[PDB]
Write a protein that binds this ligand. Structure first.
Ligand SMILES: NS(=O)(=O)c1ccc(NC(=O)COC(=O)c2c3c(nc4ccccc24)CCCCC3)cc1
Ligand SMILES: [Zn+2]
Length: 288
């Protein structure tokens, strides 16, 4: 029976209003010395609010069901009287955010690699009926080899919250689909929008609808007047045009084919999907 005492704490990886993440190593038994990330949530901070309770249980249910190389792996999960524990794989490659900052602009082949892996993760989720919604550079980590991992399926990680009712808009909203910000109803097509926004950011240096402040950003996102810079390749321009459509049902990937439709686009013409999913493709950046 796994317990908190089975793990030795090595450092604090992060913290927020609901709990903390530690780097840990297993003290004894199987995988003695194996390194994990341990997320520890305070039930007291959660159980009084039906929405947060629900969100917590959905996080654990999603992470338990998902079996995919490009989504964070949940190893153990247990609780005590006052805390919930999630033992996750430790991801040493950092945030994709740090990669965009260091490079400014990705070469197309580098962008293509990361966007391809993300699309496979989104496809896995979508066929399970799960919508990611929060695709953004900060949310995308890299393992020690440099492969993509999607994270943040649970409670709010922000230190400053937007309003007092929901945590839906606490982060940057620069990658969020217009129909979410409009509260006009949405489905898995929001993820293909977010993929486009991320792609635009990789290849230009900034998300497509940024402004001087948040209001102006939201206004631009809702207005949806896409300007594609001339230096984009024909394949990139074409895909971005198809992903960043205001009308969800027109978006590439919104169709019945979902990720399959996006993956069939000429921007991804050189991707071998079997070798990619099997992690046999050398990543563009190696955290080593
Ligand atoms: N809602 S809350 O309890 O209050 C709350 C929970 C977590 C955070 N902050 C984070 O999770 C930050 O990211 C991580 O902690 C993190 C991680 C990992 N691996 C990491 C490796 C290095 C550095 C951080 C890592 C392993 C992969 C999963 C993500 C964690 C802030 C607030
Ligand atoms: Zn919040």
């Amino acid at each position: 029976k796994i317990r908190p005492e089975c793990f030795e704490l090595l450092r604090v990886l992060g913290k927020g209003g609901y709990g903390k993440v530690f780097q840990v190593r297993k003290v004894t038994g199987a995988n003695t010395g194996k390194i994990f990330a341990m997320k520890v949530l305070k039930k007291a901070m959660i159980v009084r609010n039906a929405k947060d309770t629900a969100h917590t249980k959905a996080e654990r249910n999603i992470l338990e069901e998902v079996k995919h190389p490009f989504i964070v792996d949940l190893i153990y999960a247990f609780q005590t009287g006052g805390k919930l524990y999630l033992i996750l794989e430790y991801l040493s490659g950092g945030e994709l955010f740090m990669q965009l900052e260091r490079e400014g602009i990705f070469m197309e082949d580098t962008a293509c690699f990361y966007l391809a892996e993300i699309s496979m993760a989104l496809g896995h989720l979508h066929q399970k009926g799960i919508i990611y919604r929060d695709l953004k550079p900060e949310n995308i980590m890299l393992n020690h080899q440099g492969h993509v991992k999607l994270t943040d399926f649970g409670l709010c990680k922000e230190s400053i919250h937007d309003g007092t009712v929901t945590h839906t808009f606490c982060g940057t909203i620069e990658y969020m689909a217009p129909e979410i910000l409009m509260r006009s109803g949405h489905n898995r097509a929001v993820d293909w929008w977010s993929l486009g926004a991320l792609m635009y950011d990789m290849l230009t240096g900034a998300p497509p609808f940024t402004g001087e402040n948040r209001k102006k950003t939201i206004d631009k996102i809702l207005k949806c007047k896409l300007n594609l810079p001339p230096y984009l390749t024909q394949e990139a321009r074409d895909l971005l045009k198809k992903l960043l459509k205001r009308n969800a049902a027109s978006r590439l990937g919104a169709g019945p084919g979902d990720a399959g439709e996006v993956q069939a686009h000429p921007f991804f013409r050189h991707i071998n999907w079997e070798e990619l999913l099997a992690r046999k493709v050398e990543p563009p950046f190696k955290p080593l």
